Amino acid sequence: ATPHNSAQVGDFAETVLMCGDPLRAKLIAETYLENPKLVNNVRGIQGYTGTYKGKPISVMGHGMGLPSICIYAEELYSTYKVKTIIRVGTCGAIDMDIHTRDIVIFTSAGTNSKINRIRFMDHDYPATASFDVVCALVDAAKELNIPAKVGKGFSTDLFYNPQTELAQLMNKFHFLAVEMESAGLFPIADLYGARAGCICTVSDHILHHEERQNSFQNMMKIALEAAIKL
Amino acid sequence: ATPHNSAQVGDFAETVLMCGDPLRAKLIAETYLENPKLVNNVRGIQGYTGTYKGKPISVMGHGMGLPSICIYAEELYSTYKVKTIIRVGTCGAIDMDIHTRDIVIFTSAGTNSKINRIRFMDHDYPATASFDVVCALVDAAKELNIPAKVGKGFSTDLFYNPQTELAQLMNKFHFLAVEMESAGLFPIADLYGARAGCICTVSDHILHHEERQNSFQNMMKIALEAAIKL
Amino acid sequence: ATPHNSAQVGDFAETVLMCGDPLRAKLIAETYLENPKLVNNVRGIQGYTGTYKGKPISVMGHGMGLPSICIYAEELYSTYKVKTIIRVGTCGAIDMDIHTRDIVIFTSAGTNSKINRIRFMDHDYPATASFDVVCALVDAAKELNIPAKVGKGFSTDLFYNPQTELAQLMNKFHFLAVEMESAGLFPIADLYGARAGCICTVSDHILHHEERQNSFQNMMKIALEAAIKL
Amino acid sequence: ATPHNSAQVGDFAETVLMCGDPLRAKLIAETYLENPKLVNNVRGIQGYTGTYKGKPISVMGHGMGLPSICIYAEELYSTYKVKTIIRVGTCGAIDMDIHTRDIVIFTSAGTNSKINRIRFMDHDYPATASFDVVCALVDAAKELNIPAKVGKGFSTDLFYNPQTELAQLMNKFHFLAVEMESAGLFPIADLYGARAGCICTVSDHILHHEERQNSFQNMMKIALEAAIKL
Amino acid sequence: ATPHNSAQVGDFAETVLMCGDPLRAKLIAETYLENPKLVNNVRGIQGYTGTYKGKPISVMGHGMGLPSICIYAEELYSTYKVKTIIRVGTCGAIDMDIHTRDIVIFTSAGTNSKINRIRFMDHDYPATASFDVVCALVDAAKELNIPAKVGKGFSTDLFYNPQTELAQLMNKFHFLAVEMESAGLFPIADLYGARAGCICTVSDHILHHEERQNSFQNMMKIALEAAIKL
Amino acid sequence: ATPHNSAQVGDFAETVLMCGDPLRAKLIAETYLENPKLVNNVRGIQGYTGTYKGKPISVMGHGMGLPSICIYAEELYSTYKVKTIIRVGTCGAIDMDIHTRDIVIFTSAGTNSKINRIRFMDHDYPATASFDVVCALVDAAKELNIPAKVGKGFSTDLFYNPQTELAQLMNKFHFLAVEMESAGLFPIADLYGARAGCICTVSDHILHHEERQNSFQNMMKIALEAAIKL
């Protein structure tokens, strides 16, 4: 159907959970979904569709970086009529009060990428998570009573950032964590009148290096229950 | 105490409602606050402090534009130890599905200003409303059962914008409304580890010109009840 | 007539003196104008029209920051057919040879705002004071024999500037003082084939903190006599 | 050893061929390398190391987009002491005289990404392929007598580009093709005093949609023979 | 003494008239200066020093474009202790009310160059002519009673400008004429606490193609008399 | 024929060698060309046309800076139907391993100018030397067996650069040398479907100050022999 997806309209659920690691997407499908069926493996992206508590749900990799997820998210909303995309995964803590293993729900994401400026006449576009998705994630977190921090994220184009001062600047403004996709995903959902959100588990702290399964499994519970709520 | 405020630490409540029109700030104090006392009138900004349901609350003008509100908000958080600032007022609808008299609660605000780029190493800072404030405003709206749209706002530096295409672009990305302060307020609250939010009543639609009191009074109810919740 | 002005065409003189502080605009009207009449008080902006030496002249506030004065100046030139706008007020000295109480006449104004780039295809627009207005101000200064420094000003979007190095950089390039409106006013006057100028009294020095009435009154004399000359 | 590579120093040859599709990297290893051994599969990136004509050579995926390849290339040069990275793969033709199935060797690559500006003080960095690698690729092409076009490439951050006019602009300046990694790879090689190059087979034309194996196999021959020459 | 000047401190007068055409600088020296002596001809720049009405004055070419004049002007102020540089020459009319053969005195100059942003922390630097020089030029014009237009100029980096819309935009903002050096010269004079100005004769109109000696000679009279006044 | 060239179509050879110093262009014509005839001296640019080994070849100055060479190169390709332009001259070494008197052949050139961003929708244009010209220059160097370094150059708009850190940054990325024209020339050649290249002799090192004829003559040999090859 698309240059990066062999599936056809209908193969994907209206709600898709995405993570960077394709092998993680596979593990998520085998571990949390019932009757998971591989609907797309172009570039070994591991796109699966199954059910959770009887409801259709898909999980698929999205690569690393804004350019990668922008391709996948746009095709999903446009061609496969997906309605909600929830990014699930890991991130690097920024704020000094955020620690490894913490779970973070993004209200929005800043970025050092030029993509949003290109689509927004060189102005400041606020890459904002869909309010419904933020609410569903927070409520799921409250209902499951799992501690989660809600706040700004940052999507960097440079995992290895030459601008060593940025990290401290972001800590001063209290950015919670860094990843590489949210800032790109959110504006695309808006353009298609669809929804997007992001929830991550801190795998490390960038201002000082500091069980990882429990945190990851708790995050998956929140994302999954939230997907049902939506 | 400051170049723009004659009051001293303690004269302002920890929660301050702000609007552009100083005469509106005065009207709000006389109409909704009990025992309102003028605590600052430098530049006729009309800064009052009184109580609502027994709790201390201040209301004050903030001028028009990001540069103006940045001055007031920074002094309030820094010098007067204010904790929460809620911008209340009017805005221009962008989205075709948003209409005059509608009430909008900002999750965040985009901007064509350079202020956030200056404070954020020329990168994209997501001017995001404090999640607690967004929640308090939405809950107040739900409890009072007043219909309100939640979504992105846009703070323009140019009321009379030469870039006539921007309006349609924003409608495509579903920006809800335009005002001139939010994008500046939000990042300042973050820097001071404080809180900020914005709620407005659409006074007109910018893509087509289309009782105004009821809407304004309903908005004031939401802001006020939210202030108590916080 | 406009969203920020209740007056109608003809209520404003062709020459308008503007300052940020609305209460100062009121004081100027009562102190220097004869038969001053309030022609606009939307947002308590204090717009007055009277006469000086028999000639019609208006005085009105313009708020703080480029976005604010851009609104007022554009409406005045466009709707009220005003021909000349002279910004009168205070500023912060930059240059080491400029001192508090000094009077400065701007030849032009630099800025860290994005407004001029937006209206000038992202190029460098030289926010220049109208040569006629600069001349009228200097001649008035010479005729009244009041010492005044003529040179570049800087209109900042950030009263509290995070870029602490800018101040010293501007001192090296000999910027005379900082305010928050000129860079916005000048290009608007050009667009409407009208005129604009700026004259200020240094209320403080930003590189080192260092009677204020005499200086302010002397500045008002220059502006007023210049207004007559024009 | 690294967050994206489980291999240790020595597992990778000093020359690494990279492509976006991990499944293609696997196919290349099984088809052209002798005794190929999987040295890294973190994120299913398919990193293999074997020999070609007796010389050690590695092949591995690099994901889509500059942020992705920047991670992989920097770790390879820095941690695994790789000396030469040759990007092999597909691209979209831009120039009207370039056609589907054509083989293109990049002298350099332009981009709409902000990465190079971030690492080069906001100036214009010329993402240039290592001259040795360009020469090796061209000579291999000449020796194998396989027609190949040499010229500028373009690495876009947006596969689905909102700026529809860019394509025609690039055709006027004669950019040969578009991909999503070269502009990022080249500057990284320079920083590490290492080498990088790119060769692609046009899978389609972006200005008009227009056997694919022969072209791909011919490209692989050039890259492989060039790798030996280096 | 410098890479572009073989003269030594003292060979140049404190006032230097500069034009792009080296052959014009030579003609000016032979035609208006008494006892003109060649003090520098590196790169055939034709730097002369003589006297006008008994006062020392130099004339020299400066090449075309901001980068060229920046080299010459900086060396002159820094090494040769020159105090005033007056650019004399030709320009292209922009404004519809400006015509070929008209004489224009620049109050300032806009530009599409990046030089001023590089020296001014990426902000808007107002390339302003020294007020003393503008005054001297205008007074000379008034005393000689030669009609001259005073206003903004524009220094383009592109004689052949791809942005065909810029011309009309500048006409709307009433830029008087275009040349290629002023925007660079003015900020350099400021940095060295020196002076600079520009006066040109329109050789053609860029919005519509439309004796040339009289205009040029009249301009030279103004510049020369102004040089004496300074 | 053009505002900067009095010659007519046919007066210039299809191959033109250009240098900044007009007196050097004259010396090159008298020293290496047979029957050199002055075909253009507007602005004393010294444009000559003669023959080398029987083939028509022109040499002419181009001034200093991108704006200057852009004028000359565009007129030459457009009006005089020139096919190949080779910039010959001097440059300042950047890389620590490059020394004074070394000969450098540019594969491409970076820049701090805004010209390429203006012509390339504000994106990163890779100012690349024509591959044919790079090859001809390298082969000539190999055939004459003259040691020459091939790599990136940098065209600065500021000979006297305020950004003192740039030099070290460029050394880290291994830029070979700095000049002031290449970045402008290369994109123009592309637009006209023509060719351009650059070869220079290091006259000094910018990171530490460190016979000059031999190097210059060797460079001229390479350029000349290359011109014949093309």
Ligand SMILES: Nc1nc(F)nc2c1ncn2[C@H]1C[C@H](O)[C@@H](CO)O1
């Ligand atoms: N500390 C960290 N920093 C950055 F920039 N990204 C982090 C991260 N931890 C996880 N991620 C997520 C985002 C990318 O897809 C991928 C990068 O390894 O995994």
Ligand SMILES: Nc1nc(F)nc2c1ncn2[C@H]1C[C@H](O)[C@@H](CO)O1
């Ligand atoms: N349609 C509209 N457009 C913009 F730009 N701002 C609007 C508005 N309606 C209200 N506002 C708010 C924001 C400023 O403080 C002030 C500007 O009049 O009131």
Ligand SMILES: Nc1nc(F)nc2c1ncn2[C@H]1C[C@H](O)[C@@H](CO)O1
């Ligand atoms: N030191 C100073 N710095 C800045 F930025 N602005 C100054 C000032 N002194 C006076 N002003 C003028 C301009 C604004 O309207 C307002 C800001 O208080 O008053």
Ligand SMILES: Nc1nc(F)nc2c1ncn2[C@H]1C[C@H](O)[C@@H](CO)O1
């Ligand atoms: N027409 C085309 N346009 C763009 F932008 N990239 C193209 C392409 N054909 C192949 N590619 C390469 C680059 C990415 O890794 C990936 C994107 O599908 O494959």
Ligand SMILES: Nc1nc(F)nc2c1ncn2[C@H]1C[C@H](O)[C@@H](CO)O1
């Ligand atoms: N119409 C025109 N446009 C531009 F851009 N520059 C003009 C000009 N007429 C004269 N000049 C001056 C400036 C350069 O030094 C040189 C360019 O030919 O002469």
Ligand SMILES: Nc1nc(F)nc2c1ncn2[C@H]1C[C@H](O)[C@@H](CO)O1
């Ligand atoms: N060290 C150096 N730095 C820079 F920026 N340019 C250099 C140079 N050596 C020679 N050039 C060439 C380029 C200009 O045309 C002219 C500048 O003098 O000569």
